[PDB]
Structures are given as structure tokens and as C-alpha cells.
Amino acid sequence: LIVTQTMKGLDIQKVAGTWYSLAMAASDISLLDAQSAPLRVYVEELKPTPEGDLEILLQKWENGECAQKKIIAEKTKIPAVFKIDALNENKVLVLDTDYKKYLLFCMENSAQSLACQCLVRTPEVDDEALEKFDKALKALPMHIRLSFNPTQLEEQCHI
Amino acid sequence: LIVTQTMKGLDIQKVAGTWYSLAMAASDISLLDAQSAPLRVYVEELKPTPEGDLEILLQKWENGECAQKKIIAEKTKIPAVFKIDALNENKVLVLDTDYKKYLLFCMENSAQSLACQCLVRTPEVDDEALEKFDKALKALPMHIRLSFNPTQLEEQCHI
Ligand SMILES: CCCCNc1ccc(C(=O)OCCN(C)C)cc1
Ligand SMILES: CCCCNc1ccc(C(=O)OCCN(C)C)cc1
């Protein structure tokens, strides 16, 4: 209920597969500043379950190393909106996707912390996907933005 | 010779005084990511010498603490262009300023490392100064952008 762009007509099954975290942004610098910042997460693959939950594979820098992680985001009554079981509840929103090239999502908590990423299908700089991302962000109050080049995208934890 | 926007008609004497580093961007993430990143520098005051050199007072996080620093940027034959005596030579460029509200500058080295800041006169979020900054940046290949809120701007090293 900060983010108010969601994608109409979302077919979750078609976001399945390989993704690249091409750009990220967050509402506070410390959500992304360091390599082990809480929301510095690199997406690897999306696996929707037949029941419509979303399994997420990614990487994080945690213990001085690049570690694998698996998250499950459970479906809500809103197709573009999912829920992650954390200590405090955390909504995931799909803002926009064309399935075959890019996907924009944000994660936020119910009571002013927010992070969004531009996911792309391949290790290339997609200018217009980043345009769509920047348009979606201009509303939101972001204070850090990160972008990765094709070299880093082919590296674990984008080193 | 990456940055090709400079300000025509620059009167260096009139940038004198109090500035706030409202936003920064850099060509590589590690130039700004951590609190002690090499180019995470917060500008405090500009002091042009009568001879047209530029003294710069600022703060940096260095030794686990917010430390004062003084730099002098020496004039060149180009009024919007200055030079800092480092190990390797480092050009400072004034892209644009209206003297009384904002100033945009970049620093770069002669052989693909680059950082730019939006300096403002007061601890307020100046939307159009940030617009001008974002327009100036769209050309350049930046990969990290940081923005500070009025609270942090009134704090040493923007904590
Ligand atoms: C279309 C859905 C893409 C969403 N991908 C996501 C990626 C990461 C997260 C997420 O919550 O990661 C941060 C928590 N880590 C540190 C345990 C949540 C969703
Ligand atoms: C209009 C001129 C404003 C320029 N202000 C500047 C601020 C900082 C620097 C600069 O070089 O700072 C980084 C080097 N530190 C870590 C020793 C260079 C110029």
C-alpha cells in the first residue's frame, strides 16, 4: 500500500524460469549499500507451483560468501500480489512483465520499507526495460539505485 | 573527456560558501557502495581563492569515523574545469549551477572512473535540481545512485 502499480492479467505460470537482476532500488540506502545488505538479492530462477505459489531461487552475500537461497511466496486473492512468511509480513508485487524479456517487481512491508528490481531474461543491458523500471520508480521514494553490467550478471552475487 | 557538459560563463567566485551533497552517482558501485567507499564524500563548503583555484572542505568516513578533509582544485584554461593533485591526475568539471540554489559537478580520471553530485544550498529536497542532475547523468554510464533526505543532510557524513 505504497506501491500502486500492479500488472493486470498476470499469468504467474509464464514467469517461470531464468531471470537476471539487472537493476535494483530501495527506499533506504542501507537496504542495498553493502554486499551483505539485507535486500541485496540476486534472482536466479522463478518456479511457480501448480497451486499458484511462487518459489524463488536466488543468491545473497551473507557469511562473507555468495550463498544460495530458496524462498516461497504464497499467492493472495490478487494475482499480482504475493506474500512471504517472515517474522513480519512482507508483500511482493508484480508491477509489469512481458514474460519473454523483462519483469518489474517490488517487495514491501506493512508499516515504508521498499525494494524493487528490474529482472531481465538474459545478461544484456535492456535500455527500455530500465526505462520502464525508472518510470515505475519515479513515484516511489527511492534513495539508492544499483545497475549491473553483463560481466557481473554472469557472476555469482554479481561480483 | 567522458563528461562533455560544462557550464558556459562560470563565475567561480559565486559558488563560494555552504553546499549540501543532495545526491551522488558513480560509474562503479564500489566507488560509493559502503560508508568508506573512495568517492563517498559530502561537501561542506566551497572556497575559491582570489587567483581562481578552488578550496574544497568536505567530510569522509575513513577510519571508522566521520573525518574532515580539505582539498584544493587548481584552475585550468577552461573555467568550468579544475584539477586535483593526486597520484594520477583527476579532473573536476562544473556542469551547471545557478549559484543560488544548485550546482552539478563530476570528477573523473584520465583513463573511465567517474562520480557526479547534485550540490544544493540548503537541507531541502530540490526536485528540479535532481531533475537537472538526472538529465545530465542519462548520457554517462552510472551504476550507483544515492540520494539523502533532509534529516541525513543535517548530520555529519549524512548518517
Ligand atoms: C515475481 C516475483 C519476484 C520476487 N523475487 C523475490 C526475491 C527476493 C525476495 C526477498 O524477500 O528476498 C530478501 C529476503 N532474503 C534476504 C531472505 C522476495 C521476492
Ligand atoms: C565545483 C567543485 C566541487 C567539487 N568538489 C569536490 C569534492 C570532492 C572531490 C574529491 O576528489 O574527493 C574524493 C577524494 N577524497 C577521498 C580525498 C573533488 C571535488
Curated annotation (Swiss-Prot), chains A, B:
Alternate disulfide bonds occur in equal amounts in all variants examined. Keywords: Allergen, Disulfide bond, Milk protein, Retinol-binding, Secreted, Signal, Transport. InterPro entries: Blactoglobulin, Calycin, Lipocalin, Lipocalin_CS, Lipocln_cytosolic_FA-bd_dom. Synthesized in mammary gland and secreted in milk. The keyword GTP-binding does not apply. It is found in: Secreted. It comes from the Eukaryota. One of its GO terms (cellular component) is extracellular region. One of its GO terms (molecular function) is long-chain fatty acid binding. The keyword Signal applies. SUPFAM superfamilies: Lipocalins. Changing Q59H: In variant C; found only in the Jersey breed. CDD domains: lipocalin_beta-LG-like. It holds the Pfam family Lipocalin. Disulfide bonds join C66-C157, C106-C116, C106-C118. Gene3D superfamilies: 2.40.128.20. Primary component of whey, it binds retinol and is probably involved in the transport of that molecule. Under physiological conditions beta-lactoglobulin exists as an equilibrium mixture of monomeric and dimeric forms. Interaction with LMBR1L which mediates the endocytosis of LGB has been observed in PubMed:17991420, but not in PubMed:23964685. Belongs to the calycin superfamily. Lipocalin family. This is Beta-lactoglobulin. It comes from Bos taurus.
